[PDB]
A paper describes a structure:
The domain composition of SARM1 includes an N-terminal peptide, an ARM-repeats region, two SAM, and one TIR domain, which mediate mitochondria targeting, auto-inhibition, oligomerization, and NADase activity, respectively. Subsequently, studies have demonstrated that SARM1 is also a key part of a highly conserved axonal death pathway that is activated by nerve injury. In this way, SARM1 activation is triggered by a decrease in the concentration of a cellular metabolite NAD+, rather than depending on the introduction of an activating factor.
For cryo-EM imaging, we generated a near-intact hSARM1 construct that lacks the N-terminal mitochondrial localization signal (26ERL…GPT724) and has a point mutation in the NADase catalytic site (E642Q). 2D classification and 3D reconstruction revealed an octamer ring assembly with clearly visible inner ring, which is attributed to the tandem SAM domains. Exploring different buffers, pH and salt conditions, addition of various detergents, as well as variations in cryo-EM grid preparation (e.g. ice thickness) did not affect the visibility of the octamer peripheral ring considerably. As it became clear that the compact two-ring structure is inhibited for NADase activity, we considered whether the purified hSARM1, that was not subjected to GraFix and predominantly presents just the inner SAM ring in cryo-EM 2D averaging and 3D reconstruction, is active in vitro. We therefore measured the effect of NMN supplement on the NADase activity of purified hSARM1 and found a moderate 30% increase in activity with 1 mM NMN, but none at a lower concentration of 200 µM. This demonstrates that the purified hSARM1 is mostly NADase active, even without NMN supplement, supporting the idea of a predominantly open conformation as seen in cryo-EM.
Numbering used by the authors:
A (entry chain B): 392 to 548
B (entry chain A): 404 to 546
C (entry chain H): 400 to 545
D (entry chain C): 401 to 548
E (entry chain G): 404 to 548
F (entry chain D): 403 to 548
G (entry chain F): 402 to 545
H (entry chain E): 402 to 547
Amino acid sequence: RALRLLGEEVPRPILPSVPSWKEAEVQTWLQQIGFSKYCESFREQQVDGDLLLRLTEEELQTDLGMKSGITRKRFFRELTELKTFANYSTCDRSNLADWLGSLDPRFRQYTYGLVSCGLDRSLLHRVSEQQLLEDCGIHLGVHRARILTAAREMLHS
Amino acid sequence: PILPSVPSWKEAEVQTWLQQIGFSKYCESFREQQVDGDLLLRLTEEELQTDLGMKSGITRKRFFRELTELKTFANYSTCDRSNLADWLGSLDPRFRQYTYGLVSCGLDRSLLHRVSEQQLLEDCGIHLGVHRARILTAAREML
Amino acid sequence: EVPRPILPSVPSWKEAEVQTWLQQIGFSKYCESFREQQVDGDLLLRLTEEELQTDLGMKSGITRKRFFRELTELKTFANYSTCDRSNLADWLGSLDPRFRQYTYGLVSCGLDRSLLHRVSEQQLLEDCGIHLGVHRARILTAAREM
Amino acid sequence: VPRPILPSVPSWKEAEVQTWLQQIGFSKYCESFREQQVDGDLLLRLTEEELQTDLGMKSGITRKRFFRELTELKTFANYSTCDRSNLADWLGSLDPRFRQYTYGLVSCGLDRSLLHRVSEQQLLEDCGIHLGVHRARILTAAREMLHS
Amino acid sequence: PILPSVPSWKEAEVQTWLQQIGFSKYCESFREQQVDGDLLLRLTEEELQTDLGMKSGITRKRFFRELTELKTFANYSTCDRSNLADWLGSLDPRFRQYTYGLVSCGLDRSLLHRVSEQQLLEDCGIHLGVHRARILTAAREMLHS
Amino acid sequence: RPILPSVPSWKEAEVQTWLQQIGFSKYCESFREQQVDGDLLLRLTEEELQTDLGMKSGITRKRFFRELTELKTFANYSTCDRSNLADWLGSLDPRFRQYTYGLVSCGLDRSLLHRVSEQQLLEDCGIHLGVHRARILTAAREMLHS
Amino acid sequence: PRPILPSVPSWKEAEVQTWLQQIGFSKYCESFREQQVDGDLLLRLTEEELQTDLGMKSGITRKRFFRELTELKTFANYSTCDRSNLADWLGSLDPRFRQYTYGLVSCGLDRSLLHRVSEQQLLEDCGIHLGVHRARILTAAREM
Amino acid sequence: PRPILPSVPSWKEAEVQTWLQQIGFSKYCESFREQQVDGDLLLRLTEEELQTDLGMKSGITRKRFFRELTELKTFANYSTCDRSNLADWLGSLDPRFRQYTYGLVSCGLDRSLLHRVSEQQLLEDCGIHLGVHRARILTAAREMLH
């Protein structure tokens, strides 16, 4: 029953609908995770839920002014947590979230990446390593390999 | 309603659209650079950054988000004799956005079968590998 | 609203006719550069991105795109009879009207109908200036039959 | 439960990192580590690049001294919170010094059952095992592991 | 008319030619650099831009247009024992321009059969692939003694 | 002329003394500032010597490495060398003893040596001469185990 | 007139100086003097050395220079350094190949060793830059 | 007493200085002195060291220098460092190969080991830059009596 989601540490709300978040909800989340210093940049750049989920190292450094690699790592650590527990129902008709989660709960974080390229359960069998890296933004080879393996052993008949 | 005929748009219609999507700040650049429908549909990251002065990667992403919407719900009938728009749309509504890319290289339904992955990327401007692969696959099996 | 004359003998154009065409397509701003650089028909037909940017001072990629849009139109409807003995223009046009634009590129390398069968992909790209892969592939395919 | 023998570095907060820096004679860097908000997780995952550029440790020699201390800490740390399959003891059985790679492997979501499928590239790029000799030994031993 | 013996041209004849083709502007550079017939025939894009100060790619294209004409209608007899000029010309009049490139490497009719594509490009300065291919083809269908 | 000096356990002060003995007192300050002890001395690279210790001349670096090689040849490695690789390397060629710390720092011992590759001896262990690498590798494949 | 069998390998600075005058390169006498160019160095001169060390900035001027040097190399006496008379061997193939003598003998090649030479060796070690020349020299070397 | 072949491996700074004077490189005496070049370092000198550390900016000057050094290397006495007499072995192949002696013995090669040497080793470890030379030395090494 390892549910730290009922803990005080974890940002509120739990199970948030990040894809539909607007600037204001992004602002709230930055405060909770101790990144208030970056509120102004995120506001100016008009980061909403969709952009937050799609944020890259490059955008974070150049457009949002987060110069430290260590600070970016802290940021992505928080964003990965958010992505892991987010509600993707609006954008995830085939429930790729659960498919990824069944492989490993920490793979749920890739949901928006996969649905953003127009992948779904039916198409997943045909996905390539290149696609998972370039299109879906899965940077860890270990993760790519596991997802790829499981995708090839899917029943599409 | 009726879908706008973006391929035939002039500078003035492009200006109107920029206002509607909250990109008024860029009206002057678009005017100076004489962006019409054809050029708007064919706009690249590079042109947006260097020639139109949109320095932020995030702002460009917001812009392309709006442009993709426009491309998705545009009327291509003047330039799309074989109705590639509907073919793409039937595969996935999101693929309609690639209509102008394909017709600009002189592709139509009949020629589509012969297209390569490189061609869809370099010539047609389809950047997502997933999209390329699906379009390629479907093209070979209509043959 | 199409620039006059239609169906022009662009290969034989001098500086003056290039000047007139620039006016018609709304590029009067560039008349001075074209004049200074002494662009005639032959040079206009062979103009590259690089020459347009560096030597003619067209700094914007979007402006260059507008320019090439107009140049492509001119090339598509031009009369190549003086330089195209084997009528490659009609051969290209029969494949797709849009391919007629490549006429000068092919005849400038000394290609004709009879030699076309032997041409390579590299040759069409580097020597003939056919930049679109789709176009190269179609032209290559049709050339291998004849 | 006051003082543990093997420190729970994965669960360390900024303050414990600060204390450790003092003990190892790197007080000079306390401010940078504080400003950059280095906790246990970030300490364990620190790279050459971060140390030089973000923490301002310009000398390669100074960085070597730092990593000498970090490697010791990593070798004797308690990973129980984050290491369900006890990869620490698996690595340790091969060579005590290899226990230092625990956090690198568990951070990618590797465990004993997944070890058989791991590639040399993955050990280098994803897990941060830079010494070829170490990679080769770990790879060899992993080939005799049972998968699912 | 008379075909000029460009291989044997001196600076003065090069100067005259520049005037005739409307490149008087460049007379001084060509004089300073001591361009004779041999150097004129062997002139590269690089030399034209850097050493002779012809900055514009368009201007360089105009120049090479004139040089190609000259090369097409030059007399190569002093340096072309085996008459490669006529062999090239028979293939296509426009190929005569490559005479000096071939004879400068010590090629002749008898050696031509053995030549490689790399050699035609690097050693002989034939830049157009189409031209190279045609010359190569015709060389292989010669007399092989 | 030190007899079996225990360089792996040397502190800053012993490194300082050594620098004096070999006529490199000029570099005492940098070595002090950088806190070079025995372990760091044995693992010193060309890069660290140039950039961190301010030894700009390649010729001076060569002189320095000539002295370091001597020290490494005669050092006592007993604290870090449980399988006595030092004697094994020395028996092959006295000049190979200098590679002891490179090998034991990667956790190698007599029993493991056979599995090492030429790339590993270069990249991991710092054996720069190919001739040396090849000889060590060959002898390692033919050695007696338990 | 045109010098008969000059012993360029044995030339000293003074002879190099004289030759520069004769070919109309007096402007460069100072550089060649300062750099102490003798016969051996003249025969081994590279594009790089000519540009950077001798100050001959123009590619066209360098081309003129090498045109003269090639002539000199073609007519030189190599007897001091060419025991097996590779000069005459090369010359018999084509008079223009004589220019490569010093390149070959400087690597310690002779008639007897020539058969074993590789294309790479002729290019990198001997400084024969023209492929056409390399190929012909290689061919003839295999058949003697 | 004066030896015929100089014992360059054993030369000290003072002998190097003398040699520089004799060959007309007095201009460089100061640099060589400051850098403490002895026989060992002189024999091992590289293009890079000569340019950067000794201040010999001209490639032509460096060529003159190496011309002199090659002669010295060819006729040097290597007996202190060449127990198996590789000098005579190389010399028997071609007198000019004797110049590579110090390169070979510095990697710890001798007659008995020579059979095992690779092309890469002769280039990278021994500093034999001429392909022609490498090939001849390699060939002769393979066909030796082990």
